[PDB]
Ligand binder design. Structure first.
Ligand code: Y72
Ligand code: Y72
Ligand code: PLG
Ligand code: PLP
Lengths: 451, 455
């Protein structure tokens, strides 16, 4: 044994599973708004010798030695993080060590708040994320709701937009220390101007969770929340098309004596990440992020992202011109909130049938009473150089599924079994999927060819 | 743009950085007890297309769909995890989604304890880990000390061993709900049976954090904490020699005919997701499964046996050159060197060894409370490079020269910053450092190295 043997030679059971997933990604249509396809250049760094480096601390202030190279890699990933969103190194700093999106959020709460301090984030069935402080009416779900006290602000069931007035009303009754301006299922764009005015009034921190829209924000297509938020957190995948990791952007520098009142985010944010919450950084993921961050500064990524919104807008209209209602009436980002029960069926039903024909989406609760819609995502297939005509065949493929969906019971377990057990329906199953797989494989696929 | 362009063409600046780090690991004498060299097979999975799949949830119970393949991978990583540590699936379960070791421990505390519940681990300067509840006299440092209330137990300064007597004394006063049996800088075997007696008395969960010794435990070269612990957490790197990830093992099944059942599974799994983490890192999970498969082979047992021999040989060699060892020696993979009887501190010795391509870390000794007077040295890294006992005796000789160099520079320097700046701006010592560094790098480069050849 040397440690240099190939994966296909040493672990053939795992190699087959790698290819089964590589084939599944190639053969299907990916419409989960949070997923993408990482470049091969980043994956080469993700699976590199940087995994063998314990570098606890930060460049300059590391717990031990040997960090000659990973310091430059962390600093380069920091330099590339501020470039990808155009930020002055005197007004903004970045922490590239968070393991993922959820760790990056909990690191901000630990840094700026005390245990049981008050948190305000958009509710989960209304389009917010778990880490925004989601607890149900029976349990505290996210640990962000355990170690901190969270009250959600809901969607206006009329416009489908954020009830920016009910928020300001409750924000003075709740008196939170931080409010999260970010979403996981929301087609419109966040009015960061209202969020900052609400925050600056009740004297709360404005945190922008731009994980879903980080790529779009980098390409300067949608308004950047860096003009209003003191703290900006994001994943490095979703639309940024990078390895799974996280980032924390924070204000830096100087925010009646005549003495400058300085920003106090850097030292606290860095200390909460290490040594408070995390141990050794994942330097392989850090370098892979720097690779994908450099790709975001390129004109190609802007042309890519501009194609995502066109693919999302053309998908939205292609849904519309068939008789589909869109929550908020349309899309201005990368994903469409399809309101499905005006057509006669819900989300949990549509998402299963689409999955069986190699079309991946997620049910999402729409303003209503079993969820009533889907969250269809452009950025995944857009990275396969999809175009407006291609997504129109995707929506026509999705929609042959929903038309089966309206024809496929009573319960959801019957709906489930009737999909695969009904022999006559089971043969239309292989029919629709075979042409979806035949249509999807023809497009290119980023990353390695084999795995 | 295809997304299939190589890194060498797409980002030459990053590619040059990857090669510089690769040369540093190849040319250096890696002695950090927590570091290892991951195999190429696991690294192929770590940087694979599994990064693309969101599989929030668990096999069977997924929040989306299309996770049919990553369900088989995650289920396989669990089976290999139980087989690597010879665990009955009816008696033990395992969660394979913790992003690292620290998230694994925080998930266990969140799963089993209410906020501000009480925790007891080995104090950090005494050899415990940050995530075992460390806080200083002035500041809460680890989040283990903020969301929960921790009180440490200490070593016996006479023997260098864990004071199990004082632990039992203070545990009855403090009444912890969970005690951590695990170390980051401890050369001896932990009396898990005695830890279990203390936990059984004060009615506390016994958590075994076997991160540093997980490889030794899997190869059955040292006693297993699974024999006495309720929860076992570990990193997947270090002696397991995998990618950076975490694992949470837990009891399951059955603990007037009323058989009390184990209630760890659902609480542990809920704390990982949806409480603390989001989407699993399926690429890291597969790399862990590859390494766990490697840990079941006779080769891995021979590797772990060699790690014990190399550590003891490094310990015996240090004793011959007139060095002191905390607890008098070692029974595992690392050695705690006490440098105070020779006149140098671990802070100065760490920088000197770093400039001759010998990476170690300063370590507090039983006594100071003060710049550290000791050094932690590990065997697993170089042993993976096929180092043997004579090679480590040679490794000590290079270390002994660095210490003698550090002694000479301290006699010509004042503060610590004047010491570090002297090795870089004094030609007579700089020239003598370049000769030892070159003589060390030549020795290190000759040995094989796991992973890819160029990155
Ligand atoms: N809008 C929006 N859409 C999406 C789509 C994916 N995500 C991220 C993942 C969310 C996962 C999640 C949220 S709530 C919950 C839950 O309570 N699950 C069990 C609890 C018991 C158990 O886990 O056994 C239940 O009570 O059934 C979850 F599992 C989001 C998001 O954050 N927001
Ligand atoms: N025995 C043992 N050996 C090792 C070797 C590596 N580790 C794990 C990493 C330990 C890191 C760490 C421990 S204490 C501390 C700290 O408080 N540092 C600043 C705070 C301000 C700042 O960091 O910005 C200070 O208060 O001056 C740290 F950062 C361990 C371990 O856990 N135990
Ligand atoms: C017992 C223990 N637990 C957790 C960790 C760290 O977990 P991460 O993978 O999240 O870093 C360490 C390594 N601590 C550093 C060292 O011993 O050198 C450790 O020794
Ligand atoms: C996806 C997402 C997360 C979760 O990220 P993980 O990498 O799964 O921890 C958090 N916040 C937002 C806004 C997201 O879109």
């Amino acid at each position: 044994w040397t440690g240099q043997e190939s994966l296909s030679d040493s672990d053939p059971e795992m190699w087959e599973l790698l290819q089964r997933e590589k084939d599944r990604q190639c053969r299907g249509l990916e419409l989960i708004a949070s997923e993408n396809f990482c470049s091969r250049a980043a994956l080469e760094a993700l699976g590199s010798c940087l995994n063998n480096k314990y570098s606890e601390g930060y460049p300059g202030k590391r717990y031990y030695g040997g960090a000659e190279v990973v310091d430059e890699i962390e600093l380069l990933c920091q330099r590339r993080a501020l470039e990808a969103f155009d930020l002055d190194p005197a007004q903004w700093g970045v922490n590239v060590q968070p393991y993922s999106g959820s760790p990056a959020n909990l690191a901000v709460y630990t840094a700026l708040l005390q245990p049981h301090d008050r948190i305000m984030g958009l509710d989960l069935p209304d389009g917010g994320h778990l880490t925004h402080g989601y607890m149900s009416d029976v349990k505290r779900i996210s640990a962000t709701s355990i170690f901190f006290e969270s009250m959600p602000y809901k969607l206006n069931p009329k416009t489908g937009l954020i009830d920016y007035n009910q928020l300001a009303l409750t924000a003075r009754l709740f008196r939170p220390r931080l409010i999260i301006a970010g979403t996981s299922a929301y087609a419109r764009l966040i009015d960061y101007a209202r969020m900052r005015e609400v925050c600056d009034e009740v004297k709360a921190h404005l945190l922008a969770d731009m994980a879903h829209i980080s790529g779009l924000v980098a390409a300067k297509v949608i308004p950047s929340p860096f003009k209003h938020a003191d703290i900006v957190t994001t994943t490095t995948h979703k639309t940024l098309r990078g390895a799974r990791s996280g980032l924390i952007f924070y204000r830096k520098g100087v925010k009646k004596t005549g003495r400058e009142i300085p920003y106090t985010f850097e030292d606290r944010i860095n200390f909460a990440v290490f040594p408070s919450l995390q141990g050794g950084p994942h330097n392989h993921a850090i370098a892979a992020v720097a690779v994908a961050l450099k790709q975001a500064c390129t004109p190609m990524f802007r042309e890519y992202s501009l194609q995502v919104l066109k693919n999302a807008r053309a998908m939205a209209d292609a849904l519309l011109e068939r008789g589909y209602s869109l929550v908020s009436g349309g899309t201005d980002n990368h994903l469409v909130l399809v309101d499905l029960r005006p057509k006669g069926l819900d989300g949990a039903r549509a998402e299963r049938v689409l999955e069986l024909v190699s079309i991946t989406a997620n049910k999402n609760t729409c303003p209503g009473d079993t969820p009533g819609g889907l969250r269809l995502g452009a950025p995944a297939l857009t990275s396969r150089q999809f175009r407006e005509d291609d997504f129109r065949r995707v929506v026509d493929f999705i929609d042959e599924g929903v038309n089966i969906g309206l024809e496929v019971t009573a319960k959801l377990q019957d709906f489930k079994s009737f999909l695969l057990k009904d022999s006559e329906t089971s043969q239309r199953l292989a029919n629709l999927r075979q042409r979806v797989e035949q249509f999807a494989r023809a497009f290119p696929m980023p990353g390695f060819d084999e795995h």
